[PDB]
Amino acid sequence: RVSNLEERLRACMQKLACGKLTGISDPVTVKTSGSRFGSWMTDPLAPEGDNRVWYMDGYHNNRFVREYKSMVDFMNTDNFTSHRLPHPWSGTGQVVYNGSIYFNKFQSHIIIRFDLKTETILKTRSLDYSDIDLMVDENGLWAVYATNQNAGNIVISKLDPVSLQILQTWNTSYPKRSAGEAFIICGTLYVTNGYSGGTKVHYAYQTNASTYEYIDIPFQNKYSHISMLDYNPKDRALYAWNNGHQTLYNVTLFHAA
Amino acid sequence: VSNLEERLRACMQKLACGKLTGISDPVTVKTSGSRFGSWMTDPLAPEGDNRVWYMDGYHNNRFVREYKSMVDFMNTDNFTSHRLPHPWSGTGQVVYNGSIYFNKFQSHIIIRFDLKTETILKTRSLDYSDIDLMVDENGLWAVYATNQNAGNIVISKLDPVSLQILQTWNTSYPKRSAGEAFIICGTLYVTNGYSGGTKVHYAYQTNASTYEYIDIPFQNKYSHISMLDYNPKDRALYAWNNGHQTLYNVTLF
Ligand SMILES: *[C@@H]1O[C@H](CO)[C@@H](O[C@@H]2O[C@H](CO)[C@@H](O)[C@H](O)[C@H]2NC(C)=O)[C@H](O)[C@H]1NC(C)=O
Ligand SMILES: *[C@@H]1O[C@H](CO)[C@@H](O[C@@H]2O[C@H](CO)[C@@H](O)[C@H](O)[C@H]2NC(C)=O)[C@H](O)[C@H]1NC(C)=O
Ligand SMILES: *[C@@H]1O[C@H](CO)[C@@H](O[C@@H]2O[C@H](CO)[C@@H](O)[C@H](O)[C@H]2NC(C)=O)[C@H](O)[C@H]1NC(C)=O
Ligand SMILES: *[C@@H]1O[C@H](CO)[C@@H](O[C@@H]2O[C@H](CO)[C@@H](O)[C@H](O)[C@H]2NC(C)=O)[C@H](O)[C@H]1NC(C)=O
Ligand SMILES: *[C@@H]1O[C@H](CO)[C@@H](O)[C@H](O)[C@H]1NC(C)=O
Ligand SMILES: *[C@@H]1O[C@H](CO)[C@@H](O)[C@H](O)[C@H]1NC(C)=O
Ligand SMILES: [Cl-]
């Protein structure tokens, strides 16, 4: 199938162009709307003709997902379609991946896969261990959280996007309490210092080698508070919810291994 | 489809790249030919095309043996011979994308010869086995020594169609002292000699334009090696070992 090879080729090229984070560009304010907390994103596996933006206000008591037709439509207008999820989410760490929205069920360790076209829950899984951050990079679906197994320290888990089974789990040394926002680029989890004030990326955990090291990659916090910061492997950019603002960070990568 | 299948393979191979860390014990594929020669398979060949190309001698020969597959090559002496328009020199030939790239007899002339049409597609002279052509995950290469470089090995990235020199690197390694050499993921590995206890002890990364001396031993099973080339498709070192056809498995990192 031609459509299949084009998917495998695109995925391969993204992995081939993988690097380690060295620089974060200046943010471009996409839109100014919503409350203090929230999330906005696009589907990294969406077809070329699919540039839809998915938008979710708040980190609690909300079932409604906004669907904008395009990126330009999301900037200049407010014409969107409201989707009512069967369950409200918790936190701002959900992702739209391959036509489905993956989110954390309100006040629970339960991860839900919800098909946005069929309007149907496809899978439901509890970790039994924004408390849970779901994210996607060049390698697939991820889950970032914390356990009492660790000393409250951040935990990474690779998830099968269909069965939602944990494929592999990593222990980190970074305590979630002192953790700002986080994002995974090319299998390596980057952790920021805080949510408010001046923000920098000062922690990096490579999952391929199970090693961590302390870095220092500054990026201006254009506004007071950052409630979401997620990486999109297709755009090679950082999606951010910045205190009622939707901002985009360009990203540069340098590496060979 | 067929184009995407090849673009996917080219991408997957590049993704699995890494610097050489090990060379396994060789496997004797066949015992034939004179003391010098070269044998290979087209890295950009379809899955149904497992043909083995065979070139006996290093001086004034113009006949290439074509075996239908690895099986027919290993277990049979049934082959069809191709007559090249010009004799080659040395054992630094490569069969790339249906064409044989060889150095014209006693010259700096590289000839691209399509084996199906039996025609010469391109002919180019360089500035200067004197010229060794090889293929890795990145395409076609030319390795030799120049006059500007103090007899040191010189790498040139070639355009497989126009035989144009895209980029040139000058190593710090004298070709006279050099044994056989091969390119893996844009890095020239140079052996210590053709005979005795052989080992890879020089690696030049063309990407960073840097070099480092190493120590990667491998079994020179039949004492003398006149050909040693890397094939990015099956990730193995092809070798003409003193009238013997051998294969080395390679581990990267
Ligand atoms: C994303 O989801 C699509 C389906 O929406 C997957 O497409 C399937 O691809 C396989 C072969 O790769 C086919 O056998 C299936 O029939 C396809 N599904 C459908 C419904 O046609 C695609 O593989 C998914 N991609 C990832 C990375 O999970
Ligand atoms: C993450 O860390 C916890 C604790 O640091 C690990 O749990 C330990 O597991 C070992 C055997 O694997 C036991 O001997 C210890 O008694 C456990 N300690 C605790 C406090 O539970 C856990 O296995 C680690 N997981 C991963 C994936 O690294
Ligand atoms: C190997 O040879 C084939 C055949 O000539 C090349 O295929 C050509 O690909 C280009 C674009 O990639 C097309 O425009 C041509 O029509 C193709 N040729 C034919 C005959 O269909 C292929 O590109 C070559 N590969 C390399 C690496 O040189
Ligand atoms: C290089 O390694 C490959 C894989 O280990 C070898 O291919 C295997 O050959 C054995 C026979 O001893 C088979 O049982 C395996 O099934 C083969 N593997 C595959 C993936 O088909 C290959 O023979 C080795 N070649 C050399 C020259 O060492
Ligand atoms: C990122 O850089 C690209 C290339 O110049 C540009 O097209 C794009 O608008 C930039 N995006 C941001 C958010 O700066
Ligand atoms: C070595 O290569 C560099 C890079 O192109 C070039 O400037 C220099 O002249 C070369 N030296 C010799 C001796 O070839
Ligand atoms: Cl990767």
Numbering used by the authors:
A (entry chain B): 210 to 338, 353 to 480
B (entry chain A): 211 to 338, 353 to 477
Please share text taken word for word from the publication where this structure appeared.
This yielded diffraction quality crystals and a data set to 2.4-Å resolution. In addition to the β-propellers, a segment of the coiled-coil domain (residues Val211–Leu225) was visible in the electron density. Cys221 in this coiled-coil segment forms an interprotein disulfide, covalently linking the two β-propellers. Hence, the two β-propellers in the covalent dimer have a 60° angle between each other, resulting in an exposed outward orientation of the β-propeller top faces. Remarkably, all glycosylation sites are located at either the side or the bottom of the β-propellers, whereas the top faces are free from glycans and completely exposed.
Olfactomedin-1 (Olfm1; also known as noelin and pancortin) is a member of the olfactomedin domain-containing superfamily and a highly expressed neuronal glycoprotein important for nervous system development. It binds a number of secreted proteins and cell surface-bound receptors to induce cell signaling processes.
